[PDB]
Write a protein that binds this ligand. Structure first.
Ligand SMILES: Cc1c(C(=O)C2=C(O)CCCC2=O)ccc2c1c(=O)n(CC(=O)NCCOc1ccc3ccc4cccc5ccc1c3c45)c(=O)n2C
Ligand SMILES: Cc1c(C(=O)C2=C(O)CCCC2=O)ccc2c1c(=O)n(CC(=O)NCCOc1ccc3ccc4cccc5ccc1c3c45)c(=O)n2C
Ligand SMILES: [Co+2]
Ligand SMILES: [Co+2]
Lengths: 381, 381
């Protein structure tokens, strides 16, 4: 059931912004590890005396990395005279965020029809305002409300090229890396209490609960009208034999925040071949692979969707498989992206639900918690 | 002239420590960009609840990257019960350093015969103490005094494997990258006033002024007895037509600090081939290459040291060449390592002064300021 109750017109995920200590080093690491091209910049070389911001792209996926300069460079500016390209940026907020949480996502940005109306409707329906609508070069409007923790939901709307004041990157510095990643599928938050978090976000967005089918968590998914903006939220389950990874997250993150980004690949086999080649030479590491019993058990579960060879290809790459009533999910998880056991990445590809493919086809892999446990037991033997 | 006036026995450069916001991302970027292997770690997985520290090595070059965890993880510890492997580490100091200066060098570490005596003699001779001698696992002693700005000179001495509490890295995560870099040749600081900085450091070390032969700077080099520890220091020259890069550094760094690290390569041609291949795929960028007139002028200057082909190889890679009365220097400079126009790297190789090669053979390339200017004028034509 989908009541299509969005209180304003939402289009697609637009970008994800990381708040960093040094944007250059994080952006270069991510570019190589994920196969994303340097696409745009806003920094001292573009006249921005406030923050350094570098944009990476792969298909429609946009990752923005931002760090503050010394406040002394902009000490004579006021908001009316700012050289910042992102007017919501604040030195103190950024330093406080990073000192509290370490490297992580500050903004989950969605494109909307009218960012001013989305902001107004959101706040009228309980959203805590974070940054008011600001019109950039009479061309783009940006506004921000609190999502959870210190993560904001950023609304962006365009009259008619990322943001004004950003410059396209010199193609000598823009190597055309591409490992197959194409868009953000979903963005997942960890909170201490799922109920109040769901009520708050669904309250100001009108997003509905997305249909699904002790492992340490309870979760639910909020979805826009066409179910292409997907925002799962997790809470810990306390008292388990194995400590909840959600609780570990909350401890090391100093509270609620974004847990993982799920990145859709148009060819998850190529993406994982390319990412795994680079794990130990600057890229990203992956979770330990499931035992071979897991891949023998795949024949009975998805043998009508994947051939034996395609199943063997999943086994070589450590890919997990889950199934809905409508489709099939291929997924895999990285180790944490930075020092703290907090944020990580998921690579996914979805099979089925052709109408275009409907959002969320095959679910989110919750069936893989039980399958992994069974598989671990069976391999013990 | 070398009076050999060291007030304590100094051996060689031991390591360089960067203070980071996220050590993982900086270390992975540097590993790929410079061809350094992940060699050791001290972090949550080794029981360190205080800081994440990752060691990269290439030959005898040791780069350490350290970032603080949430203080909450160690809030019950005191110094007698600390799980930090580097007892001088302090959360507040590290966050303050990084917020003030951005990514940069906190510690220039030299190995000495006895770190406790070096500390005591240094402080008796004017050094400002930063961290007192602490004996680690009855095996290593570490002590720190102020060098310039918020950079410390760290003394390390060994009774008889980096530091106790560090663990060797799993060789699955330890890819054997190597682009030819072999050791730290020199480490250069920028200060507002050269005179007082020289008097202070030479005062507590006994290091002597190393012999040499308007560009925006005055410089001098302090050297240990065998001239293998080399510490140049720069001050700006004000009022020049082109603003001093030293003054720009001081402004963007919020004061004095480490300007560049010069890394000796055993094969600078291979090192630059490998580094330039990776510049736009996560590595380091290099300064703009000098015009071809510079390389035509090399025949008259070093045609007795480099063949035409070896000169052409310098031209393909953008390598600079300078000459002393004793030897020849091949050098090249990276663009800044992070967001701010502050710290950068120099790659060097020295030719001549065979006895082993004496320290500082061929100088530091000061002749290349004038040669570059002449070369730029000639290419204008
Ligand atoms: C995240 C996820 C999903 C998922 O998408 C999802 C949604 O979209 C919405 C619905 C709810 C939900 O779940 C589905 C299936 C998953 C997983 C998943 O995450 N996982 C495994 C894991 O645990 N991944 C994170 C691992 O965390 C850590 C990794 C590495 C470390 C290394 C050293 C460490 C040292 C000290 C403490 C540490 C704590 C946590 C550490 C860690 C520590 C899995 O198996 N399935 C099968
Ligand atoms: C450093 C050095 C040595 C050297 O070893 C040395 C010693 O060992 C001890 C004795 C004193 C000394 O000198 C020798 C020769 C050098 C150089 C050297 O450094 N150079 C060129 C340059 O300038 N390298 C740093 C470039 O800084 C910047 C690079 C890139 C940017 C990009 C964007 C920017 C935007 C805005 C502001 C910026 C400010 C500064 C920016 C910058 C800015 C050179 O040519 N020779 C020839
Ligand atoms: Co997911
Ligand atoms: Co130098």
């Amino acid at each position: 059931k989908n009541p299509k109750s969005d209180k304003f017109k939402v289009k697609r995920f637009h970008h994800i912004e990381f708040w960093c200590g040094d944007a250059t080093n994080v952006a270069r690491r991510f570019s190589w590890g994920l196969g994303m091209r340097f696409s745009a910049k806003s920094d001292l070389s573009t006249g921005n005396m406030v923050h350094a911001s570098y944009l990476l792209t792969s298909g429609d996926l946009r990752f923005l990395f931002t760090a503050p300069y010394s406040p002394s460079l902009s000490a004579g500016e006021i908001k009316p005279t700012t050289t910042a390209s992102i007017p919501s940026f604040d030195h103190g907020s950024c330093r406080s965020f990073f000192s509290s949480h370490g490297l992580g996502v500050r903004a989950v940005a969605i494109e909307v029809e009218d960012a001013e109306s989305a902001f107004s409707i959101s706040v009228a329906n309980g959203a805590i305002p974070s940054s008011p609508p600001i019109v950039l070069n009479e061309a783009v409007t940006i506004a921000e409300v609190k999502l959870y923790g210190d993560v904001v939901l950023r609304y962006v709307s365009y009259k008619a090229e990322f943001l004004p004041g950003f410059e396209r990157v010199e193609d000598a510095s823009s190597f055309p890396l591409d490992y197959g990643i194409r868009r953000l599928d979903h963005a997942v938050g960890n909170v201490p209490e799922l109920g109040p978090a769901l009520t708050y976000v669904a309250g100001f967005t009108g997003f509905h609960q997305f249909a699904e089918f002790e492992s340490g968590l309870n979760s639910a998914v909020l979805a826009s009208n066409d179910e292409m903006v997907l925002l799962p939220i997790n809470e810990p389950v306390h008292g388990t034999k194995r400590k909840s990874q959600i609780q570990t997250y909350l401890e090391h993150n100093e509270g609620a925040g974004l847990q993982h980004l799920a990145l859709m690949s148009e060819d998850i086999f190529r993406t994982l071949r390319e990412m795994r080649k680079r794990s130990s030479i600057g890229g990203f590491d992956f979770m330990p692979s499931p035992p071979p019993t897991y891949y023998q058990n795949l024949k009975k579960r998805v043998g009508d969707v994947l051939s034996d060879d395609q199943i063997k290809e999943c086994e070589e790459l450590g890919i997990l498989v889950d199934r809905d009533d409508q489709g099939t999910l291929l997924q895999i998880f990285t180790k944490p992206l930075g020092d703290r056991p907090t944020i990580f990445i998921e690579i996914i590809q979805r099979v089925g639900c052709m109408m275009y493919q409907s959002g969320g086809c095959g679910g989110f892999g919750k069936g893989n918690f039980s399958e992994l446990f069974k598989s671990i037991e069976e391999y013990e033997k």
